[PDB]
Amino acid sequence: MTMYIAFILSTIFVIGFVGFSSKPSPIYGGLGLIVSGGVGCGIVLNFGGSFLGLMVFLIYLGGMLVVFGYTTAMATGDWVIYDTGDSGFFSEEAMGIAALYSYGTWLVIVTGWSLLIGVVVIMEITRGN
Amino acid sequence: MNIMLTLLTNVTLASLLVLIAFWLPQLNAYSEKRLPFSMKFFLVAITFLLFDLEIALLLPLPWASQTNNLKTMLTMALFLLILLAASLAYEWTQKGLEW
Amino acid sequence: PFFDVQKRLGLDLDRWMTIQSAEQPHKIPGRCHAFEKEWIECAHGIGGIRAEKECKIEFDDFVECLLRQKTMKRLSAIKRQRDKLIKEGKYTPPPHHLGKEDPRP
Amino acid sequence: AKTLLHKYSDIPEGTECHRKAYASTSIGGATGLIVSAYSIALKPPASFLEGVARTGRYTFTSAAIGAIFGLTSCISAQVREKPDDPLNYFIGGCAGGLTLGARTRSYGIGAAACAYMGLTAALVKMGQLEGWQVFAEPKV
Amino acid sequence: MPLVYMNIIMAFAIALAGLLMYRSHLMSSLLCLEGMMLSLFIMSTLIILNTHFTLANMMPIILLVFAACEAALGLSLLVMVSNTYGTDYVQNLNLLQC
Amino acid sequence: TMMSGRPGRVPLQFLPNEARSLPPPKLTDPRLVYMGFLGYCSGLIDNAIRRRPVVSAGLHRQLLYVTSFVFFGYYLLKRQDYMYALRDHDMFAYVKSHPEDFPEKDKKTYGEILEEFHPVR
Amino acid sequence: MNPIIYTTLIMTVMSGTMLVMISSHWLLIWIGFEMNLLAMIPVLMKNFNPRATEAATKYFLTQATASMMLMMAIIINLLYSGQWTITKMFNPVAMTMMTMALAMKLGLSPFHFWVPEVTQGISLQAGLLLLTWQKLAPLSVLCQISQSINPNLMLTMAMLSILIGGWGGLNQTQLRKIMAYSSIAHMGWMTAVLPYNTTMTILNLLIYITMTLAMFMLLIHSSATTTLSLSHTWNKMPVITSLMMVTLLSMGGLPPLSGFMPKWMIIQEMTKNESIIMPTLMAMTALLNLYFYMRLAYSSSLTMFPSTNNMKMKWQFEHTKQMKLLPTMIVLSTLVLPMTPALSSLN
Amino acid sequence: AGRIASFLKNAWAKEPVLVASFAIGGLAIILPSLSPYTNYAIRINRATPYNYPVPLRDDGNMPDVPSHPQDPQGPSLEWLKNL
Amino acid sequence: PGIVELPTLEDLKVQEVKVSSSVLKAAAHHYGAQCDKPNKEFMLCRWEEKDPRRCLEEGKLVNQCALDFFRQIKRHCAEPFTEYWTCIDYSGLQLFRHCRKQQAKFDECVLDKLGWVRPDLGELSKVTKVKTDRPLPENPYHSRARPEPNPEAEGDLKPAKHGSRLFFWTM
Numbered sequence A: 001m002t003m004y005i006a007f008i009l010s011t012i013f014v015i016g017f018v019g020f021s022s023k024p025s026p027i028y029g030g031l032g033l034i035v036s037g038g039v040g041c042g043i044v045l046n047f048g049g050s051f052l053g054l055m056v057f058l059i060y061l062g063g064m065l066v067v068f069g070y071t072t073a074m075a076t077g078d079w080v081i082y083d084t085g086d087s088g089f090f091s092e093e094a095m096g097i098a099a100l101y102s103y104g105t106w107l108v109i110v111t112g113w114s115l116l117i118g119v120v121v122i123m124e125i126t127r128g129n
Numbered sequence B: 001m002n003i004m005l006t007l008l009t010n011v012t013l014a015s016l017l018v019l020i021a022f023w024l025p026q027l028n029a030y031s032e033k034r035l036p037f038s039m040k041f042f043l044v045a046i047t048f049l050l051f052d053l054e055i056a057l058l059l060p061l062p063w064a065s066q067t068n069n070l071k072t073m074l075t076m077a078l079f080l081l082i083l084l085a086a087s088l089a090y091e092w093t094q095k096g097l098e099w
Numbered sequence C: 001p002f003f004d005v006q007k008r009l010g011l012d013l014d015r016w017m018t019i020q021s022a023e024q025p026h027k028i029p030g031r032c033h034a035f036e037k038e039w040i041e042c043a044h045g046i047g048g049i050r051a052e053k054e055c056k057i058e059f060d061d062f063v064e065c066l067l068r069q070k071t072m073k074r075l076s077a078i079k080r081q082r083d084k085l086i087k088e089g090k091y092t093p094p095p096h097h098l099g100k101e102d103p104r105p
Numbered sequence D: 001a002k003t004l005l006h007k008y009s010d011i012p013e014g015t016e017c018h019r020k021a022y023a024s025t026s027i028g029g030a031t032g033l034i035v036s037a038y039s040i041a042l043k044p045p046a047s048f049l050e051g052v053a054r055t056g057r058y059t060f061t062s063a064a065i066g067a068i069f070g071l072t073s074c075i076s077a078q079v080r081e082k083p084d085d086p087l088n089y090f091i092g093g094c095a096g097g098l099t100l101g102a103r104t105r106s107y108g109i110g111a112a113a114c115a116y117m118g119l120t121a122a123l124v125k126m127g128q129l130e131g132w133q134v135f136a137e138p139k140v
Numbered sequence E: 001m002p003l004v005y006m007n008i009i010m011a012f013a014i015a016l017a018g019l020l021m022y023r024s025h026l027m028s029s030l031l032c033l034e035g036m037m038l039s040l041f042i043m044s045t046l047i048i049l050n051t052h053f054t055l056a057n058m059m060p061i062i063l064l065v066f067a068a069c070e071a072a073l074g075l076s077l078l079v080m081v082s083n084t085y086g087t088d089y090v091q092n093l094n095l096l097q098c
Numbered sequence F: 001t002m003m004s005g006r007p008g009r010v011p012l013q014f015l016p017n018e019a020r021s022l023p024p025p026k027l028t029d030p031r032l033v034y035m036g037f038l039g040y041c042s043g044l045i046d047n048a049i050r051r052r053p054v055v056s057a058g059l060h061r062q063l064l065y066v067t068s069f070v071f072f073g074y075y076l077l078k079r080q081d082y083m084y085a086l087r088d089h090d091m092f093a094y095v096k097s098h099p100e101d102f103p104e105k106d107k108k109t110y111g112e113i114l115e116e117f118h119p120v121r
Numbered sequence G: 001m002n003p004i005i006y007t008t009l010i011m012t013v014m015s016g017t018m019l020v021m022i023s024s025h026w027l028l029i030w031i032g033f034e035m036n037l038l039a040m041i042p043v044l045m046k047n048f049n050p051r052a053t054e055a056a057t058k059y060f061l062t063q064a065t066a067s068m069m070l071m072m073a074i075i076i077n078l079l080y081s082g083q084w085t086i087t088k089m090f091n092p093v094a095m096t097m098m099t100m101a102l103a104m105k106l107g108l109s110p111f112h113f114w115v116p117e118v119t120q121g122i123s124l125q126a127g128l129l130l131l132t133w134q135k136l137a138p139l140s141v142l143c144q145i146s147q148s149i150n151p152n153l154m155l156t157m158a159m160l161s162i163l164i165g166g167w168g169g170l171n172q173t174q175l176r177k178i179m180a181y182s183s184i185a186h187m188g189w190m191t192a193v194l195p196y197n198t199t200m201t202i203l204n205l206l207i208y209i210t211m212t213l214a215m216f217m218l219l220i221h222s223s224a225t226t227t228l229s230l231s232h233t234w235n236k237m238p239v240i241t242s243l244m245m246v247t248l249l250s251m252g253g254l255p256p257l258s259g260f261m262p263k264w265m266i267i268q269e270m271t272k273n274e275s276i277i278m279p280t281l282m283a284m285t286a287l288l289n290l291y292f293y294m295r296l297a298y299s300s301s302l303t304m305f306p307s308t309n310n311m312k313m314k315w316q317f318e319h320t321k322q323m324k325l326l327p328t329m330i331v332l333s334t335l336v337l338p339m340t341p342a343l344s345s346l347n
Numbered sequence H: 001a002g003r004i005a006s007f008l009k010n011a012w013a014k015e016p017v018l019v020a021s022f023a024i025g026g027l028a029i030i031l032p033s034l035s036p037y038t039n040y041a042i043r044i045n046r047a048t049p050y051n052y053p054v055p056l057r058d059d060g061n062m063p064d065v066p067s068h069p070q071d072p073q074g075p076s077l078e079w080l081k082n083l
Numbered sequence I: 001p002g003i004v005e006l007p008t009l010e011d012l013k014v015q016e017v018k019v020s021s022s023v024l025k026a027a028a029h030h031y032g033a034q035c036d037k038p039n040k041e042f043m044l045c046r047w048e049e050k051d052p053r054r055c056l057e058e059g060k061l062v063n064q065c066a067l068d069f070f071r072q073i074k075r076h077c078a079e080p081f082t083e084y085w086t087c088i089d090y091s092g093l094q095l096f097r098h099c100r101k102q103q104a105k106f107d108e109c110v111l112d113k114l115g116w117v118r119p120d121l122g123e124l125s126k127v128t129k130v131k132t133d134r135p136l137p138e139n140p141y142h143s144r145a146r147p148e149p150n151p152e153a154e155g156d157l158k159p160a161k162h163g164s165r166l167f168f169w170t171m
């Protein structure tokens, strides 16, 4: 065994959470959270969740930790539980994620309404006056 | 294994080059002698974030086109894009995209 | 409280996503699908109290499949005893478990 | 947790006083530690040293209360040769109240504490005897 | 339940405790909620992938989206509070009391 | 008695079909009269809040208050009677189906029951 | 704000609560909670001032922490059984996480600290909304999983809520803080009967909502947020003060008023389960709520406080805007005790 | 008619990007409901075998089910080939 | 709870098909056309029994039939097949389109030698019927007996006796 690479990744995840949970110099806490997010993305990718890991790493990191850093700058045992068979000539994760439009019409409707309301709410809150 | 090794090689080469650049001129001796917080930048960041969230939902569209339910998938994709357009229109007409 | 609008209207707003064995895309099968199907068929209409007291065998099997704790315990026991024997020196692994076997397609 | 509850309750009431006193002391100390944690959270007085001093005083007060209650109640039950009597518990409660008054150095609180604690102790014994349920399970 | 799940759970617990500490800098509070949601995403993804439950592959993304939307609102709130005081200190929010 | 999960319960029916086998409440029911009285009180309070002659400001509005209260009260009484009828029906059926849990007491006269006597002195 | 945007936000809050109430999937319940929280903040910040912003940020922090805890409970429950349906939890740890999340959302002690401050910061209409409509979804979820709850924890939090509300209301001069502590005590009363009868929980919720609506609309009509401001109302609107006194008497649980219906019934229910001590303590503690209601009644309608000279000008004007349902709310909150058996309607 | 024509001419000047975007979006919404090749796309998606076709146990009452793929009975893909 | 029974190592010994995936892909269409009956027997047994231990002889049969198919290929047109598979093996995606000419030569050789017609598009994906004499498993899931349902009482509603009977209310 590669000395439990998943276990050491989870350990680095916990260590990073301890790192930014002390909340020193919120830029340093943000950087610790960025490292933790990268490590969690590595965990998900090594597990087999390529699309979900890349969604973490793109959306989470590149958008919202980026916006948090922007706002802050403006201010002052493994390998065992796994499967045996194969998937076919497609990836089950992509098909299941892909199925939301065909199957998850209700989820799409509620999520889109929530996002539009969120835009309206942000503008109203930041309106000022 | 290949991707981790490639990442490690890239980071190692970048680090080696930056440190040699930062220490090559350090061997020879030389002389060696606010508040404003504009609101519009936060708003453009938040708009990018809201738009980014919308982007994730579509991401599965390339795979969504093989379902045998083409009508429902097309309707929901167009609904999502229409709501993204409506968010853009609402922020446009409320002076949310101005400087 | 719970207003069962879906049952009254026959809508199926979110019931497609509640259990493993409910019409997955491309007929992909859940790992614990057989166990969950048996547990559901045991406990249908019986009610929660009687389901909890009477369908305990199927739920235990379903839980075991989901978490595999007893399988982990058995495998750990086997590995630990094998390690003890190899440390003592009275057991030798066969060529199959050392990578010296003849692989099959 | 209920581990201390079981440790206290398992000992027979009319015998073996020192373990009853020890168990009641531990229960009181745990209660005082919880109270000290809440007090530190809601009211951080000035610093670390005064906070640890306040925890020490609360814990020692509650432990002394529990020790005196257990010791006096068990001794009363033993000498009176009448177990399952709420009077023994009442006496223990009164003793506990007296100890609390001494710590606060108040005649009124000591007297007030003694009467109230004794009544509470008597009621707990009556509940043990009669099977009263503070937290009843859903029966009907 | 193997060690990876307990590691992610204790990561969530550490993030929750760090949020409940409130040294200062409400931005740190938002960061702690953010680490909480990240741990939730990781563990839900692991559970769903391990059990091959094909449909709930949707719900991590959705969770992310919703949580991310929440983050946006929080940032707005933080910003507005700063506009009143010039800093995002926790101790400035004592106008309302019990 | 939690009847939410009772079998054959249509989710959002105020009154099921079987409730039609029960006698409807009379229109002179005292509870209906109390509902009408509550509507009249609401009308008087509405007049008082608006600074209008309390007894004789709006007769149409007071009539509407009384009528709406009576209407809703009638339907509410129907539903209440139906639910109590279901409770009794289920209780009797359960007693009938489980005789071993409700054994018959042996009828015993006071002549051979010994009750302790306590004098008052 | 724009009336269109305000109506959209109100319907979004109601749709979130509705989403929570009609769904059978834990993810959809969580989504409904998220929608409700998202649309609730601008309502609290409808009138802009620093106090409202502080109240909104405190409310957001509390509700977001509760939502994260609730999602943790959902994921743990999924881990120990691959189920998404809202039913019995099947995990001891998950149930506790769920119970604490819902207690934080409801404002039950010891998670009560945010309610008085948020209520004081926001306006009267926002407070009406927060104290009436924002209790439906968590209580509905609690009713759905009542067979799972540990009675010890729920009853401990209920008794703590009753005690905290009773004691904290005694120290208040501000009307909104009085309403907040009253709501905390009433939530404590509601959650003590969940382990035994959810119908009594719903009956208590309905009676409390009726009384709270009446009291808030009376406070809005006579635009007072302090005791001394309310003490001036008799010199302009004595009938409003009389109605407010009767409503306060009802809220204190006096027979034959409507407020006596829940506690009585709840006590009765708790006696069928061989629980005697706990209802006794609950009633003795509700005496504190009655005391501060009576103090408010003394200051408002039972005595005539001094007035000012400018009040004369207010004698020449009448309210332009009226609440249509205020008389009905008053009558339903004072005079429905004879109709108690109607609770069989499984309200 | 005339007012609509005036509005479209006034928007086509000084706002051509918005006019083009709205026209393209409207076409993307409307045209799919009228195209006759949408059902062809659905049929093509149905004809893509991702899974093994599990045979059915013969019971003597299955005339439309083939015994061999070469048999005439069964779905054909000649419409796909001609496309 | 119980002992899991497994076949002996001798039961799992079979004459194996030792050709690579490029050869298999080159032959796949004619293999599906020719060796169909044992394959469908095996797969129907496999989805009906839901147990590998109950399908071993059918697997031996499909191995034997595949061996027979490849022996026929070897005997009549080894060279045409070899050239065709060389092309398939070269490509990383093993695309059929890349070497159409090799396939055409192979198709002509088999038809003349064995009269084999290559299946058309949409044929190998058909759902077909299998004539088998193996009995249908009556309890393939090994389920227990379902618990008895609740009594499901029925009757005709009557008014509640003496009303609600709640405290002092007479109705």
Ligand SMILES: CCCCCCCCCCCCCCCCCC(=O)OC[C@H](COP(=O)([O-])OCC(O)COP(=O)([O-])OC[C@@H](COC(=O)CCCCCCCCCCCCCCCCC)OC(=O)CCCCCCCCCCCCCCCCC)OC(=O)CCCCCCCCCCCCCCCCC
Pocket (backbone or CB within 6 Å): F040, F041, F044, F045, F048, F052, F053, F054, F055, G238, G239, G242, G243, G246, G256, G301, G302, G334, G335
């Ligand atoms: C047990 C059940 C059975 C009994 C039921 C009891 C309840 C029934 C009624 C419930 C509510 C309905 C009325 C409420 C609206 C308010 C009206 C009002 O303000 O009075 C003025 C009004 C007369 O004044 P006005 O010249 O028109 O206008 C001047 C302003 O309105 C007023 O002039 P102002 O505003 O300038 O004067 C200021 C004054 C004005 O402020 C007020 O007086 C407001 C009234 C109190 C609010 C009531 C709250 C809601 C009711 C709940 C009651 C709880 C009962 C439970 C027991 C606990 C007791 C508290 O405020 C004060 O002075 C403040 C200090 C007073 C001390 C603290 C207040 C104590 C409150 C407790 C009252 C409870 C009994 C009230 C009885 C009805 C009062 C009219 O009174 C009436 O005429 C209405 C009385 C009812 C009409 C009956 C018509 C039927 C007769 C013919 C048909 C015969 C029937 C039989 C058929 C067979 C025949 C052949």
Ligand SMILES: CCCCCCCCCCCCCCCCC[C@@H](O)O[C@H](CO[C@H](O)CCCCCCCCCCCCCCC)COP(=O)(O)OCC[N+](C)(C)C
Pocket (backbone or CB within 6 Å): A102, A103, A105, A106, A109, A113, B069, B071, B072, B075, B076, B079, C011, C012, C013
């Ligand atoms: C009936 C009551 C009407 C009044 C109440 C409305 C309540 C709010 C409005 C939102 C609820 C709309 C209900 C739609 C639920 C979706 C499920 C149902 O409609 O069937 C779907 C049909 O989907 C259709 O596309 C419906 C399209 C409707 C959505 C487009 C616009 C929705 C806007 C509603 C509000 C959104 C924000 C506000 C916009 C102005 C599934 O199609 P299908 O594929 O066969 O089945 C899938 C299962 N398979 C995979 C086995 C085959």
Ligand SMILES: CCCCCCCCCCCCCCCCC[C@@H](O)O[C@H](CO[C@H](O)CCCCCCCCCCCCCCC)COP(=O)(O)OCC[N+](C)(C)C
Pocket (backbone or CB within 6 Å): C001, C002, C003, C004, F004, F010, F011, F012, F013, F014, F076, G199, G202, G203, G206, G207, G210, G332, G333, G336, G339, G340, G341, G342, G343, G345, G346, G347
């Ligand atoms: C204090 C006064 C409060 C009054 C309440 C407001 C009055 C106005 C309401 C307007 C009419 C309401 C009727 C609704 C129409 C359809 C009802 C249907 O949708 O719901 C049914 C049931 O409707 C309600 O249960 C009946 C509401 C009646 C409330 C009155 C009882 C209040 C106690 C007595 C106090 C006196 C009040 C009378 C004077 C006005 C089926 O519910 P179900 O989907 O199966 O399960 C959900 C409930 N569970 C979970 C508890 C099981």
Ligand SMILES: CCCCCCCC/C=C\CCCCCCCC(=O)O[C@H](COC(=O)CCCCCCC/C=C/CCCCCCCC)COP(=O)(O)OCCN
Pocket (backbone or CB within 6 Å): B082, B085, B086, B088, B089, B090, B092, B093, H008, H011, H015, H018, H019, H020, H021, H022, H023, H024, H025, H026, H029
């Ligand atoms: C049914 C299809 C819907 C989906 C398609 C749309 C997808 C993306 C497009 C929408 C994005 C959001 C649009 C938001 C609209 C705001 C426009 C606006 O406010 O701009 C006005 C001006 O723009 C306007 O006039 C409003 C819209 C004008 C009409 C644009 C096209 C409308 C439809 C035309 C074609 C319709 C269909 C085809 C007809 C043609 C024949 C085929 C002011 O401009 P400023 O930059 O702020 O300041 C300039 C002054 N100093």
